[PDB]
Structure 1
Amino acid sequence: HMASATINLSAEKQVIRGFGGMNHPVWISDLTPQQRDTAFGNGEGQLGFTILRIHVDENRNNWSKEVATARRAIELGAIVSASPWNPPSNMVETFTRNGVPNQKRLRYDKYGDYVQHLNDFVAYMKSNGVDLYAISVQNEPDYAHEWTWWTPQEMLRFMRDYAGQINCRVMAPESFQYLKNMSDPILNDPQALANLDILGAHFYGTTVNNMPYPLFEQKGAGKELWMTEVYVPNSDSNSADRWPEALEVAHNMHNALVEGNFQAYVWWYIRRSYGPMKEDGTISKRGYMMAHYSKFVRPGYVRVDATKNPTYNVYLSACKNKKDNSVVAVVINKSTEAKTINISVPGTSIRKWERYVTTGSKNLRKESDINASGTTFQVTLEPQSVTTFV
């Protein structure tokens, strides 16, 4: 039997900003020179990442450790965003939170000093050849057992009365789970919303039903939407090549893009035993899942409407290159059976797709071209696979 899907090139959705991951040379080892190239180049055997995330150290004597990786990322065409975990210690005080004592927050009398600390980091990185794309108010203000807590109202006061002085695009609030209570106050206050440039969110435990954001569709004109940190489905030691488990990475990216309208998807540590690049410097199954998007859906491409679930266990997304109206379709098949789909692309002059396939036994393998019959491309997806058509 034969399933169907339609890609509508005239129904444009979000512009793609890019894909990438975290570097943190204070908590773990920096990327090496060769690993910087594997991450940020887009040749064969490279990931094609176009976003680097870094941390803003509370101790300025550590800032120089960021520079070499961030410079090489930019030279290879990536953008850089930075997130703080704590303010300098002289700006912090303690409080008791839900009966747990000794918890950290920014002193209310130090909000202006904290603006200056962020600006000092921006200017230091600029002096060193790293013009940051954006800087965040706080990493996970709502999951801060091990760092600095901010309530929705503390975040709001900072966004409204201080964030306009930051000499960079401002990212907020980076909830651990995209909890809307952290961001609704910013969207609902005209001055706080003016001082926002990127709505940042993490995805830990975020379900599909919680990926849409009606208030952001209503009030978010001119603001970018980025998923700035996750790992999925777990951080188990030495898990990065497990199959078919790695398919959950692809699915979570599909869901960010299509269910959440996200413009960016950013992993936690780039190099790690559960990450996209293994400790031996080679790409993991989880990394190939990312690569099906990152190598092909380049910054400035625009997502378009496409049948998202054409048959059980099959998931489709499509993005268009506005330079020539060509399309990139990424199709996941979680079934133990092969699936054949007629994909209609009305109004296209394109008549041939190339395809790259990942299964448990091959990585980004170039398979036989698809020749269209008129504007319909009939494709067959191997069981337990991801295919990118270009």
Structure 2
Amino acid sequence: HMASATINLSAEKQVIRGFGGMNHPVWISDLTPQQRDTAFGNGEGQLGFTILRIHVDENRNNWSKEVATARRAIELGAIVSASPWNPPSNMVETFTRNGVPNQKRLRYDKYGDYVQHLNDFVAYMKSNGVDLYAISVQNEPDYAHEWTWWTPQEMLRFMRDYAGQINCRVMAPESFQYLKNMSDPILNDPQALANLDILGAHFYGTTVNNMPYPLFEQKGAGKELWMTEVYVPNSDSNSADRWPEALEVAHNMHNALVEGNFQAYVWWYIRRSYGPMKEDGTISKRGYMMAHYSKFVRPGYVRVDATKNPTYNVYLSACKNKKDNSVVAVVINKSTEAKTINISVPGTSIRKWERYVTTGSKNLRKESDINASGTTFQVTLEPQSVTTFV
């Protein structure tokens, strides 16, 4: 019952860059033409994704496999970032890491060659109509049991001494868990920081208390902040429609936006049995959770200060469209009870919100409009639901 929240449209936070997920046409099947439209279109039954992540293959003969989905994503208005897992094998050497032998790292004398490999990929994609928004130094340098490890100091050396030569925005360090030991050295070194454009992070097991990043708030002016890979709360086979499990996706996104100030949120495989799109090409409960943000909170909108947790089990975020000062509010109710919130939006001329609601038994159902009383919007959230107000 009667909890209160305020959305302050004059307290601007981060500009939203967008939402999306991974295509990997070497490890798994490429997205089909139909599936590309479902992912990056924003019509009814489409996810409204605006970021595609792709991998930079170690074998340049595989590069052409990325082109068809990347082009289509860009055609439908998305931006594309690319992350490598391994350098070409002729730049790699083995070493023993914490007792475990035969681990991979980039040879210290091949960092320049690696720069050239990354630029070659950038040039190749650009030649094929895919102007990459950014390229990463390494996917999960700190969880590279099955790929290429970089220590914090190896990542720093590359960012400080080589990264300035990359002909693209540079993304780093993509820690599997947003471990600050991988990024702190970049932030604390002016040359490395100058060569950084996007601080990328993954959210695997990342807790809410570790989503703020004081050093980035202090030193990261002009750099973007992106959450470039996750699945939550698990990758269990055929789990994408589990309810109320799926509510963890919305909550994680809420947390990324509000607790982490993240400008982008990017899932792992777009099409997978635990992903936003099921193998049959339709949207899963997990996908609808993503859609509550991605279909409505469009690139260029700016998050604004809003009461994040107005009552127990209720989570609120708000973004402003600066073109007309309209507001999008996404409100999660994880309670088994219904909740009523008086949302104060001082200084707004808006007096009506439309609303779409997802529960265990309905997906983005358009429900009755909210008519404001002055600048206060009283909203009711049914149990175990996500609502987007627009």
TM-score, length-scaled by structure 2: 1.00
Percent identity for Structure 1 against Structure 2: 100
SS in 2 for 1:364: strand
In the TM superposition, residue 334 of structure 1 has moved relative to its aligned partner by: 0.4
Matching of residue 94 in structure 1 with residue 94 in structure 2: yes
2:240 equivalent in structure 1: 240
Alpha-carbon distance, 1:9 to partner: 0.4
Shift of residue 80 of structure 1?
0.2
- 1:77-99: per-residue Cα shift (whole Å, max 9, x none)? 00000000000000000000001
Question: Residue 297 of structure 1: CA displacement?
Answer: 0.3
Q: CA deviation at 1:190?
A: 0.5
Cα shift at 1:177: 0.2
User: 2:138 & 2:370 partners in 1: Cα distance?
Assistant: 47
Cα distance in 1 for partners of 2:242, 2:152 equals: 39
Deviation for aligned residue 1:295: 0.3
Aligned length: 390
Deviation at 1:7, TM superposition (A): 0.4
Q: Tell me by how many angstroms 1:233 deviates.
A: 0.1
* Partners of 1:150 and 1:370 in 2: CA distance: 51
CA distance in 1, matches of 2:112, 2:36: 36
Superposition deviation, residue 359 in structure 1: 0.2
Q: Deviations over 1:163-206 (max 9, x none)?
A: 00000000000000000000000000000000000000000000
1:331 maps to 2:348: no
Q: CA deviation at 1:157?
A: 0.4
Partner of 2:174: 174
Offset of 1:221 from its aligned partner?
A: 0.4
Residue 264 of structure 1 aligns with which residue?
264
Any idea what the Cα deviations from partners look like across 1:112-131, whole Å, max 9, x if unmatched?
Answer: 00000000000000010000
Distance 1:13 1:110 in 2: 40
| Alpha-carbon shift at residue 305 of structure 1 (Å) | 0.5
2: CA distance, partners of 1:99 / 1:356:
53
State the SS of the aligned residue for 1:215: helix
Alignment of 1:45-194 (within 5 A): 45-194=45-194
Partner residue of 2:374? Answer: 374
Offset at residue 153 of structure 1 (A): 0.4
Q: How far apart, in 2, do the equivalents of 1:186 and 1:335 lie?
A: 41
Shift, 1:327, TM fit? 0.2
- Which SS does the other structure have where 2:149 is aligned? coil
CA shift, 1:229, in A, is: 0.1
- Specify the SS of the correspondent of 1:251: helix
Give the Cα–Cα distance (whole angstroms) in 1 for the partners of residues 33 and 190 of structure 2. Answer: 44
| 1:119-150 CA distance string (max 9 Å, x none) | 00000000100000000000000000000000
CA drift of 1:11 comes to: 0.3
1:14-71 CA distance string (max 9 Å, x none): 0000000000000000000000000000000100000000000000000000000000
Q: For residue 61 of structure 1, give the secondary structure of its aligned residue in structure 2.
A: helix
Superposition deviation, residue 232 in structure 1: 0.1
SS at the partner of 2:254? helix
Q: Cα offset for 1:214? A: 0.3
Structure 1 residue 209, shift from structure 2 partner: 0.2
Residue 5 of structure 1, CA deviation: 0.4
The 3-state SS of whatever aligns with 1:363 is: strand
- SS in structure 1 opposite 2:253? helix
Q: Matches of 2:216 and 2:63 in 1, distance apart?
A: 34
CA distance in 1, matches of 2:170, 2:249: 28
Query: Separation in 1 of the partners of 2:162 and 2:185?
Result: 15
- 2: distance between equivalents of 1:188 and 1:378? 46
Distance apart, 1:351 and its partner CA: 0.4
Residue 288 in structure 1 maps to residue 288 in structure 2: yes
Which residue is equivalent to 2:197? 197
Residue 316 of structure 1 aligns to a residue in which SS?
Answer: strand
1:124 aligns to what SS in structure 2?
A: helix
TM-score, scaled to structure 1: 1.00
Give a deviation string over 1:233-292, Cα, whole Å, max 9, x none. 000000000000000000000000000000000000000000000000000000000000
Distance 1:122 1:79 in 2: 14
Write the distance in 2 (CA, Å) between the matches of 1:305 and 1:111. Answer: 42
Q: Distance in 1 between matches of 2:71 and 2:170?
A: 21
Question: Tell me, which stretches of 5 or more residues in structure 1 are unaligned?
Answer: none
Residue in 1 aligned with 2:208? 208
What RMSD in Å do the two structures reach over aligned CA positions? 0.4
Question: How far did 1:328 drift?
Answer: 0.2
Q: CA deviation at 1:386?
A: 0.2
Distance in 1 separating the partners of 2:108 and 2:220: 28
Shift of 1:102: 0.3
Structure 2 counterparts to residues 331-350 of structure 1, below 5 A: 331-350=331-350
